[PDB]
């Protein structure tokens, strides 16, 4: 399922340099701030040779190439970020990008798995995974707080990895009827989820709201229900008609969904808009991680097991997990207020109110699953 013990859904030790064959791509991606500002970004993209993807032969080089092409694509479409957009992606980016995206089974737009899960390095390999020892590989504009937003997102993923590695213990304990082992597992998950909540606080240290809202959000925006590209984007030379794809959001994280699925909280049940969105966002996750979520829904229910045993210790450990999720969602809502709602007050579903209502629906659905 391509889940790492240490960093979870994050790509371990991402690749940083492509083969020299792709130098022309890497130069543009590494210089987005200068090229966007000077107005050379679009000219440089339009001057690119067509580069075959046949020199990208392992998962790490393909993932780096997707991140490179994805950042180039956002810079090309959105430009300087003030409404002068391009609705046609030139063939010499669109064709290799779409081919690579098909091989990796991801849509041809920058997604969370590119610009967070694969967009990072350790400064010192001998030091731990702390903010001070980490950097991103690509940013869009000087002052866009991309390092802070991407790395804090990644730090939440790494924190969650401590809980994700316990999930097999949970199902093995239910299968083997190991009550004490299951109780310890559920409590360990809840403890890790509250430590993940502590990581959330780091966003205030590294991301300021004006920069995030007015700059970074622009470059992460997509072309699904977006009035600036109402029919989607033309991937020139690959598909004739434009296609719509959503921009990035926290709902693309597998961490956002996997614990609800583990605990039997049915966030994708029904035809409601929140459910449909979370189902649709699975298409924006790496296929192995989609598969992991699907396997969790097919396993015997943790929730029915705990409810069937007349075990107040099991129910409370389960409830500790649920409350931890509820806290996480509530802090998530505070982030929406500080980083979106308030900056806005001075694309369909992108509106801060729609984002707010979505998280409130999710948090309510989580609260409903409390046993007592
Ligand atoms: C392409 C792309 C897509 C997404 C992202 N990373 C992002 O969105 N992180 C995020 C955003 C919001 C706010 C805007 C509203 C939302 O999108 O729901 C709240 C919380 C978070 N996390 C932890 C934070 C403390 C940084 C998320 C919360 C769920 C688990 C992962 C981290 C980066 C690039």
CSV table of N, CA and C in Angstrom, one decimal, residues 81-228:
chain,number,residue,atom,x,y,z
A,81,UNK,N,-0.9,35.4,-11.0
A,81,UNK,CA,-1.9,35.2,-10.0
A,81,UNK,C,-2.9,36.3,-9.8
A,82,UNK,N,-3.1,37.1,-10.8
A,82,UNK,CA,-4.1,38.2,-10.7
A,82,UNK,C,-5.2,38.2,-11.7
A,83,UNK,N,-5.4,37.1,-12.4
A,83,UNK,CA,-6.5,37.0,-13.4
A,83,UNK,C,-6.1,36.8,-14.8
A,84,UNK,N,-4.8,37.0,-15.2
A,84,UNK,CA,-4.4,36.8,-16.6
A,84,UNK,C,-4.0,35.3,-16.7
A,85,UNK,N,-4.9,34.5,-17.2
A,85,UNK,CA,-4.8,33.1,-17.1
A,85,UNK,C,-4.6,32.5,-18.5
A,86,UNK,N,-4.1,31.3,-18.6
A,86,UNK,CA,-4.0,30.6,-19.9
A,86,UNK,C,-4.9,29.4,-19.8
A,87,UNK,N,-5.7,29.1,-20.8
A,87,UNK,CA,-6.7,28.1,-20.9
A,87,UNK,C,-6.2,26.9,-21.7
A,88,UNK,N,-5.0,26.9,-22.3
A,88,UNK,CA,-4.4,25.9,-23.1
A,88,UNK,C,-3.1,25.6,-22.6
A,89,UNK,N,-2.8,24.3,-22.1
A,89,UNK,CA,-1.5,23.9,-21.7
A,89,UNK,C,-0.7,23.4,-22.9
A,90,UNK,N,0.4,24.0,-23.3
A,90,UNK,CA,1.1,23.7,-24.5
A,90,UNK,C,1.5,22.2,-24.5
A,91,UNK,N,1.5,21.7,-25.8
A,91,UNK,CA,1.7,20.2,-26.0
A,91,UNK,C,2.9,19.7,-25.4
A,92,UNK,N,4.0,20.5,-25.4
A,92,UNK,CA,5.3,19.9,-24.9
A,92,UNK,C,5.4,19.8,-23.4
A,93,UNK,N,4.4,20.4,-22.7
A,93,UNK,CA,4.2,20.0,-21.3
A,93,UNK,C,3.0,19.0,-21.2
A,94,UNK,N,1.9,19.3,-21.9
A,94,UNK,CA,0.7,18.5,-21.6
A,94,UNK,C,0.9,17.0,-22.0
A,95,UNK,N,1.5,16.7,-23.1
A,95,UNK,CA,1.6,15.3,-23.5
A,95,UNK,C,2.5,14.5,-22.5
A,96,UNK,N,3.7,14.9,-22.2
A,96,UNK,CA,4.5,14.1,-21.2
A,96,UNK,C,3.8,14.1,-19.8
A,97,UNK,N,3.2,15.2,-19.4
A,97,UNK,CA,2.5,15.3,-18.1
A,97,UNK,C,1.3,14.3,-18.1
A,98,UNK,N,0.5,14.3,-19.1
A,98,UNK,CA,-0.6,13.4,-19.2
A,98,UNK,C,-0.2,11.9,-19.2
A,99,UNK,N,0.9,11.7,-19.9
A,99,UNK,CA,1.4,10.3,-20.0
A,99,UNK,C,1.9,9.8,-18.7
A,100,UNK,N,2.7,10.7,-18.0
A,100,UNK,CA,3.2,10.4,-16.7
A,100,UNK,C,2.0,10.2,-15.7
A,101,UNK,N,1.0,11.1,-15.8
A,101,UNK,CA,-0.1,11.0,-14.9
A,101,UNK,C,-0.9,9.7,-15.1
A,102,UNK,N,-1.1,9.3,-16.3
A,102,UNK,CA,-1.7,8.0,-16.5
A,102,UNK,C,-0.9,6.8,-15.9
A,103,UNK,N,0.4,6.9,-16.1
A,103,UNK,CA,1.2,5.8,-15.5
A,103,UNK,C,1.1,5.7,-14.0
A,104,UNK,N,1.1,6.9,-13.4
A,104,UNK,CA,1.0,7.0,-11.9
A,104,UNK,C,-0.5,7.0,-11.4
A,105,UNK,N,-1.4,7.0,-12.3
A,105,UNK,CA,-2.9,6.9,-12.0
A,105,UNK,C,-3.3,8.1,-11.1
A,106,UNK,N,-2.8,9.3,-11.5
A,106,UNK,CA,-3.2,10.6,-10.9
A,106,UNK,C,-3.7,11.5,-11.9
A,107,UNK,N,-4.6,12.4,-11.6
A,107,UNK,CA,-5.1,13.4,-12.6
A,107,UNK,C,-4.0,14.4,-12.9
A,108,UNK,N,-4.0,14.9,-14.1
A,108,UNK,CA,-2.9,15.9,-14.5
A,108,UNK,C,-3.1,17.3,-14.0
A,109,UNK,N,-3.1,17.4,-12.7
A,109,UNK,CA,-3.1,18.7,-12.0
A,109,UNK,C,-2.2,18.5,-10.7
A,110,UNK,N,-1.6,19.6,-10.2
A,110,UNK,CA,-0.8,19.4,-9.0
A,110,UNK,C,-1.8,19.0,-7.9
A,111,UNK,N,-1.4,17.9,-7.2
A,111,UNK,CA,-2.2,17.4,-6.0
A,111,UNK,C,-1.3,17.4,-4.8
A,112,UNK,N,-2.0,17.1,-3.7
A,112,UNK,CA,-1.3,17.0,-2.4
A,112,UNK,C,-0.2,16.0,-2.4
A,113,UNK,N,-0.4,14.9,-3.1
A,113,UNK,CA,0.7,13.9,-3.1
A,113,UNK,C,1.9,14.4,-3.9
A,114,UNK,N,1.8,15.4,-4.7
A,114,UNK,CA,3.0,16.0,-5.4
A,114,UNK,C,3.6,17.0,-4.5
A,115,UNK,N,2.8,18.0,-4.2
A,115,UNK,CA,3.4,19.2,-3.6
A,115,UNK,C,3.6,19.2,-2.1
A,116,UNK,N,3.1,18.1,-1.4
A,116,UNK,CA,3.4,17.9,0.0
A,116,UNK,C,4.2,16.6,0.1
A,117,UNK,N,3.6,15.5,-0.3
A,117,UNK,CA,4.1,14.2,0.0
A,117,UNK,C,5.5,13.9,-0.7
A,118,UNK,N,5.7,14.5,-1.8
A,118,UNK,CA,6.9,14.3,-2.6
A,118,UNK,C,7.8,15.5,-2.6
A,119,UNK,N,7.4,16.6,-2.0
A,119,UNK,CA,8.1,17.9,-2.2
A,119,UNK,C,8.9,18.3,-0.9
A,120,UNK,N,9.8,17.5,-0.6
A,120,UNK,CA,10.5,17.7,0.7
A,120,UNK,C,11.9,17.0,0.8
A,121,UNK,N,12.7,17.5,1.7
A,121,UNK,CA,14.0,16.9,1.9
A,121,UNK,C,14.4,17.2,3.4
A,122,UNK,N,15.4,16.4,3.8
A,122,UNK,CA,16.1,16.7,5.1
A,122,UNK,C,17.3,17.5,4.7
A,123,UNK,N,17.6,18.6,5.5
A,123,UNK,CA,18.8,19.3,5.4
A,123,UNK,C,20.0,18.4,5.8
A,124,UNK,N,19.9,17.8,7.0
A,124,UNK,CA,20.9,16.8,7.4
A,124,UNK,C,20.2,15.5,7.5
A,125,UNK,N,20.7,14.5,6.7
A,125,UNK,CA,20.1,13.1,6.8
A,125,UNK,C,20.3,12.5,8.2
A,126,UNK,N,21.3,12.9,9.0
A,126,UNK,CA,21.5,12.3,10.3
A,126,UNK,C,20.7,12.9,11.4
A,127,UNK,N,19.9,14.0,11.1
A,127,UNK,CA,19.1,14.6,12.1
A,127,UNK,C,17.6,14.2,11.8
A,128,UNK,N,16.7,14.4,12.8
A,128,UNK,CA,15.3,13.9,12.7
A,128,UNK,C,14.5,14.8,11.8
A,129,UNK,N,13.2,14.3,11.7
A,129,UNK,CA,12.2,15.0,10.8
A,129,UNK,C,11.5,16.1,11.6
A,130,UNK,N,12.2,17.2,11.8
A,130,UNK,CA,11.7,18.4,12.4
A,130,UNK,C,11.7,19.5,11.3
A,131,UNK,N,10.8,20.5,11.5
A,131,UNK,CA,10.8,21.6,10.6
A,131,UNK,C,12.1,22.2,10.3
A,132,UNK,N,12.9,22.4,11.4
A,132,UNK,CA,14.2,23.1,11.3
A,132,UNK,C,15.2,22.3,10.5
A,133,UNK,N,15.0,21.0,10.3
A,133,UNK,CA,15.8,20.1,9.5
A,133,UNK,C,15.2,19.7,8.2
A,134,UNK,N,14.2,20.5,7.7
A,134,UNK,CA,13.5,20.1,6.5
A,134,UNK,C,13.3,21.3,5.6
A,135,UNK,N,13.2,21.0,4.3
A,135,UNK,CA,12.9,22.1,3.3
A,135,UNK,C,12.0,21.5,2.2
A,136,UNK,N,11.4,22.3,1.5
A,136,UNK,CA,10.6,21.9,0.3
A,136,UNK,C,11.6,22.0,-0.9
A,137,UNK,N,11.1,21.3,-2.0
A,137,UNK,CA,11.9,21.4,-3.2
A,137,UNK,C,11.5,22.5,-4.2
A,138,UNK,N,10.2,22.8,-4.2
A,138,UNK,CA,9.7,23.8,-5.1
A,138,UNK,C,8.7,24.8,-4.4
A,139,UNK,N,8.8,26.0,-4.7
A,139,UNK,CA,7.9,27.1,-4.3
A,139,UNK,C,7.5,27.9,-5.6
A,140,UNK,N,6.4,28.7,-5.4
A,140,UNK,CA,5.9,29.4,-6.5
A,140,UNK,C,6.4,30.9,-6.6
A,141,UNK,N,6.2,31.6,-5.5
A,141,UNK,CA,6.6,33.0,-5.4
A,141,UNK,C,7.3,33.3,-4.1
A,142,UNK,N,8.2,34.2,-4.2
A,142,UNK,CA,8.8,34.6,-2.9
A,142,UNK,C,7.8,35.2,-2.0
A,143,UNK,N,7.8,34.8,-0.7
A,143,UNK,CA,6.8,35.2,0.2
A,143,UNK,C,5.5,34.4,0.2
A,144,UNK,N,5.4,33.3,-0.6
A,144,UNK,CA,4.1,32.6,-0.7
A,144,UNK,C,3.9,31.7,0.5
A,145,UNK,N,4.8,31.5,1.4
A,145,UNK,CA,4.7,30.6,2.6
A,145,UNK,C,4.5,29.2,2.2
A,146,UNK,N,4.9,28.8,1.0
A,146,UNK,CA,4.8,27.4,0.5
A,146,UNK,C,5.6,26.5,1.4
A,147,UNK,N,6.8,26.9,1.8
A,147,UNK,CA,7.6,26.0,2.7
A,147,UNK,C,6.8,25.7,4.0
A,148,UNK,N,6.3,26.8,4.6
A,148,UNK,CA,5.6,26.6,5.8
A,148,UNK,C,4.3,25.8,5.7
A,149,UNK,N,3.5,26.1,4.7
A,149,UNK,CA,2.3,25.3,4.5
A,149,UNK,C,2.5,23.9,4.1
A,150,UNK,N,3.4,23.7,3.1
A,150,UNK,CA,3.7,22.3,2.7
A,150,UNK,C,4.3,21.5,3.8
A,151,UNK,N,5.3,22.1,4.5
A,151,UNK,CA,6.0,21.3,5.5
A,151,UNK,C,5.2,21.0,6.7
A,152,UNK,N,4.3,22.0,7.1
A,152,UNK,CA,3.5,21.7,8.3
A,152,UNK,C,2.4,20.6,7.9
A,153,UNK,N,1.9,20.7,6.7
A,153,UNK,CA,1.0,19.6,6.2
A,153,UNK,C,1.8,18.3,6.2
A,154,UNK,N,3.0,18.2,5.8
A,154,UNK,CA,3.8,17.0,5.8
A,154,UNK,C,4.0,16.6,7.3
A,155,UNK,N,4.3,17.6,8.2
A,155,UNK,CA,4.5,17.2,9.6
A,155,UNK,C,3.3,16.5,10.2
A,156,UNK,N,2.1,17.0,9.8
A,156,UNK,CA,0.9,16.3,10.2
A,156,UNK,C,0.9,14.9,9.7
A,157,UNK,N,1.3,14.7,8.4
A,157,UNK,CA,1.3,13.3,7.8
A,157,UNK,C,2.2,12.4,8.6
A,158,UNK,N,3.4,13.0,9.0
A,158,UNK,CA,4.4,12.1,9.7
A,158,UNK,C,3.9,11.8,11.0
A,159,UNK,N,3.3,12.7,11.7
A,159,UNK,CA,2.7,12.5,13.0
A,159,UNK,C,1.6,11.4,12.9
A,160,UNK,N,0.8,11.5,11.9
A,160,UNK,CA,-0.2,10.4,11.7
A,160,UNK,C,0.4,9.1,11.4
A,161,UNK,N,1.6,9.0,10.9
A,161,UNK,CA,2.2,7.7,10.6
A,161,UNK,C,2.3,6.9,11.8
A,162,UNK,N,2.5,7.5,13.0
A,162,UNK,CA,2.6,6.7,14.2
A,162,UNK,C,1.3,6.0,14.5
A,163,UNK,N,0.1,6.5,14.1
A,163,UNK,CA,-1.1,5.8,14.3
A,163,UNK,C,-1.4,4.8,13.1
A,164,UNK,N,-1.0,5.2,11.9
A,164,UNK,CA,-1.3,4.3,10.8
A,164,UNK,C,-0.6,3.0,10.9
A,165,UNK,N,0.6,3.0,11.5
A,165,UNK,CA,1.3,1.7,11.7
A,165,UNK,C,0.7,0.8,12.7
A,166,UNK,N,-0.2,1.3,13.5
A,166,UNK,CA,-1.0,0.5,14.5
A,166,UNK,C,-2.2,-0.2,13.9
A,167,UNK,N,-2.7,0.3,12.7
A,167,UNK,CA,-3.9,-0.2,12.2
A,167,UNK,C,-3.9,-1.7,11.9
A,168,UNK,N,-2.8,-2.3,11.4
A,168,UNK,CA,-2.8,-3.8,11.3
A,168,UNK,C,-2.9,-4.5,12.7
A,169,UNK,N,-2.3,-3.9,13.7
A,169,UNK,CA,-2.5,-4.5,15.1
A,169,UNK,C,-4.0,-4.5,15.5
A,170,UNK,N,-4.7,-3.5,15.1
A,170,UNK,CA,-6.2,-3.4,15.4
A,170,UNK,C,-6.9,-4.6,14.8
A,171,UNK,N,-6.7,-4.8,13.5
A,171,UNK,CA,-7.5,-5.8,12.8
A,171,UNK,C,-7.0,-7.2,13.2
A,172,UNK,N,-5.7,-7.4,13.5
A,172,UNK,CA,-5.1,-8.6,13.9
A,172,UNK,C,-5.7,-9.0,15.3
A,173,UNK,N,-5.8,-8.0,16.2
A,173,UNK,CA,-6.3,-8.2,17.5
A,173,UNK,C,-7.8,-8.6,17.5
A,174,UNK,N,-8.6,-8.0,16.6
A,174,UNK,CA,-10.0,-8.4,16.5
A,174,UNK,C,-10.1,-9.9,15.9
A,175,UNK,N,-9.3,-10.1,14.9
A,175,UNK,CA,-9.3,-11.5,14.3
A,175,UNK,C,-8.9,-12.5,15.3
A,176,UNK,N,-7.8,-12.3,16.0
A,176,UNK,CA,-7.3,-13.2,17.0
A,176,UNK,C,-8.0,-13.1,18.4
A,177,UNK,N,-9.0,-12.3,18.5
A,177,UNK,CA,-9.7,-12.1,19.8
A,177,UNK,C,-8.7,-11.8,20.9
A,178,UNK,N,-7.9,-10.8,20.7
A,178,UNK,CA,-6.9,-10.4,21.7
A,178,UNK,C,-7.4,-9.0,22.3
A,179,UNK,N,-8.2,-9.1,23.3
A,179,UNK,CA,-8.9,-7.9,23.9
A,179,UNK,C,-7.9,-6.9,24.3
A,180,UNK,N,-6.9,-7.3,25.2
A,180,UNK,CA,-5.9,-6.3,25.7
A,180,UNK,C,-5.1,-5.7,24.6
A,181,UNK,N,-4.8,-6.5,23.6
A,181,UNK,CA,-4.0,-5.9,22.5
A,181,UNK,C,-4.8,-4.9,21.7
A,182,UNK,N,-6.1,-5.1,21.5
A,182,UNK,CA,-6.9,-4.2,20.8
A,182,UNK,C,-7.1,-2.9,21.6
A,183,UNK,N,-7.3,-3.0,22.9
A,183,UNK,CA,-7.4,-1.9,23.8
A,183,UNK,C,-6.2,-1.0,23.7
A,184,UNK,N,-5.0,-1.6,23.8
A,184,UNK,CA,-3.8,-0.8,23.7
A,184,UNK,C,-3.6,-0.2,22.3
A,185,UNK,N,-4.0,-0.9,21.3
A,185,UNK,CA,-3.9,-0.3,19.9
A,185,UNK,C,-4.8,0.9,19.8
A,186,UNK,N,-6.1,0.8,20.2
A,186,UNK,CA,-7.0,2.0,20.1
A,186,UNK,C,-6.5,3.2,20.9
A,187,UNK,N,-6.0,2.9,22.1
A,187,UNK,CA,-5.5,4.0,22.9
A,187,UNK,C,-4.2,4.6,22.3
A,188,UNK,N,-3.4,3.8,21.7
A,188,UNK,CA,-2.2,4.3,21.0
A,188,UNK,C,-2.5,5.2,19.8
A,189,UNK,N,-3.5,4.8,19.1
A,189,UNK,CA,-4.0,5.6,18.0
A,189,UNK,C,-4.5,6.9,18.5
A,190,UNK,N,-5.3,6.9,19.6
A,190,UNK,CA,-5.9,8.2,20.1
A,190,UNK,C,-4.7,9.1,20.6
A,191,UNK,N,-3.7,8.5,21.2
A,191,UNK,CA,-2.6,9.3,21.7
A,191,UNK,C,-1.9,10.0,20.5
A,192,UNK,N,-1.7,9.2,19.4
A,192,UNK,CA,-1.0,9.7,18.2
A,192,UNK,C,-1.8,10.8,17.5
A,193,UNK,N,-3.2,10.6,17.5
A,193,UNK,CA,-4.0,11.7,16.9
A,193,UNK,C,-4.0,12.9,17.7
A,194,UNK,N,-3.8,12.9,19.1
A,194,UNK,CA,-3.7,14.1,19.8
A,194,UNK,C,-2.4,14.8,19.6
A,195,UNK,N,-1.3,14.0,19.5
A,195,UNK,CA,0.0,14.5,19.1
A,195,UNK,C,0.0,15.2,17.7
A,196,UNK,N,-0.8,14.6,16.8
A,196,UNK,CA,-1.0,15.2,15.5
A,196,UNK,C,-1.7,16.6,15.7
A,197,UNK,N,-2.6,16.7,16.6
A,197,UNK,CA,-3.3,18.0,16.8
A,197,UNK,C,-2.3,19.0,17.3
A,198,UNK,N,-1.3,18.6,18.1
A,198,UNK,CA,-0.3,19.5,18.5
A,198,UNK,C,0.6,20.1,17.4
A,199,UNK,N,0.8,19.2,16.3
A,199,UNK,CA,1.5,19.7,15.2
A,199,UNK,C,0.8,20.8,14.4
A,200,UNK,N,-0.6,20.7,14.5
A,200,UNK,CA,-1.4,21.8,13.8
A,200,UNK,C,-0.9,23.2,14.2
A,201,UNK,N,-0.5,23.3,15.5
A,201,UNK,CA,-0.2,24.6,16.0
A,201,UNK,C,1.0,25.3,15.2
A,202,UNK,N,1.8,24.4,14.6
A,202,UNK,CA,3.0,24.9,13.9
A,202,UNK,C,2.6,25.8,12.6
A,203,UNK,N,1.3,25.7,12.2
A,203,UNK,CA,1.0,26.5,11.0
A,203,UNK,C,1.1,28.0,11.3
A,204,UNK,N,0.7,28.4,12.5
A,204,UNK,CA,0.8,29.8,12.9
A,204,UNK,C,2.2,30.3,12.9
A,205,UNK,N,3.2,29.4,13.1
A,205,UNK,CA,4.6,29.8,13.2
A,205,UNK,C,5.2,30.0,11.8
A,206,UNK,N,4.6,29.5,10.8
A,206,UNK,CA,5.3,29.4,9.5
A,206,UNK,C,4.5,29.9,8.3
A,207,UNK,N,3.2,30.2,8.5
A,207,UNK,CA,2.3,30.6,7.4
A,207,UNK,C,1.6,31.8,7.8
A,208,UNK,N,1.7,33.0,7.0
A,208,UNK,CA,0.8,34.0,7.5
A,208,UNK,C,-0.4,34.1,6.5
A,209,UNK,N,-1.6,34.5,7.1
A,209,UNK,CA,-2.9,34.4,6.4
A,209,UNK,C,-2.9,35.2,5.1
A,210,UNK,N,-2.4,36.4,5.1
A,210,UNK,CA,-2.5,37.2,3.9
A,210,UNK,C,-1.8,36.6,2.7
A,211,UNK,N,-0.5,36.1,3.0
A,211,UNK,CA,0.3,35.5,1.9
A,211,UNK,C,-0.4,34.2,1.5
A,212,UNK,N,-0.9,33.4,2.4
A,212,UNK,CA,-1.5,32.1,2.1
A,212,UNK,C,-2.8,32.4,1.2
A,213,UNK,N,-3.6,33.3,1.7
A,213,UNK,CA,-4.9,33.5,1.0
A,213,UNK,C,-4.7,34.2,-0.3
A,214,UNK,N,-3.9,35.2,-0.4
A,214,UNK,CA,-3.8,36.0,-1.6
A,214,UNK,C,-2.8,35.5,-2.7
A,215,UNK,N,-1.9,34.6,-2.3
A,215,UNK,CA,-0.9,34.2,-3.2
A,215,UNK,C,-0.9,32.6,-3.3
A,216,UNK,N,-0.6,31.9,-2.2
A,216,UNK,CA,-0.5,30.5,-2.3
A,216,UNK,C,-1.7,29.8,-2.8
A,217,UNK,N,-2.9,30.2,-2.3
A,217,UNK,CA,-4.1,29.6,-2.7
A,217,UNK,C,-4.4,29.8,-4.2
A,218,UNK,N,-3.9,30.9,-4.7
A,218,UNK,CA,-4.1,31.1,-6.2
A,218,UNK,C,-3.4,30.0,-7.0
A,219,UNK,N,-2.2,29.7,-6.6
A,219,UNK,CA,-1.4,28.7,-7.4
A,219,UNK,C,-1.9,27.3,-7.1
A,220,UNK,N,-2.5,27.0,-6.0
A,220,UNK,CA,-3.1,25.7,-5.8
A,220,UNK,C,-4.5,25.5,-6.4
A,221,UNK,N,-5.1,26.6,-6.9
A,221,UNK,CA,-6.4,26.5,-7.4
A,221,UNK,C,-6.5,25.6,-8.7
A,222,UNK,N,-7.7,25.0,-8.9
A,222,UNK,CA,-7.9,24.1,-10.0
A,222,UNK,C,-8.8,24.7,-11.1
A,223,UNK,N,-9.3,23.8,-12.0
A,223,UNK,CA,-10.2,24.2,-13.0
A,223,UNK,C,-11.4,23.3,-13.0
A,224,UNK,N,-12.0,23.1,-11.9
A,224,UNK,CA,-13.3,22.4,-11.8
A,224,UNK,C,-14.3,23.4,-11.2
A,225,UNK,N,-15.3,23.7,-11.9
A,225,UNK,CA,-16.3,24.7,-11.5
A,225,UNK,C,-15.6,26.0,-11.2
A,226,UNK,N,-14.6,26.4,-11.9
A,226,UNK,CA,-13.9,27.6,-11.7
A,226,UNK,C,-14.2,28.6,-12.8
A,227,UNK,N,-14.8,29.8,-12.5
A,227,UNK,CA,-15.3,30.7,-13.5
A,227,UNK,C,-14.2,31.3,-14.4
A,228,UNK,N,-12.9,31.2,-13.9
A,228,UNK,CA,-11.8,31.7,-14.7
A,228,UNK,C,-11.4,30.8,-15.8
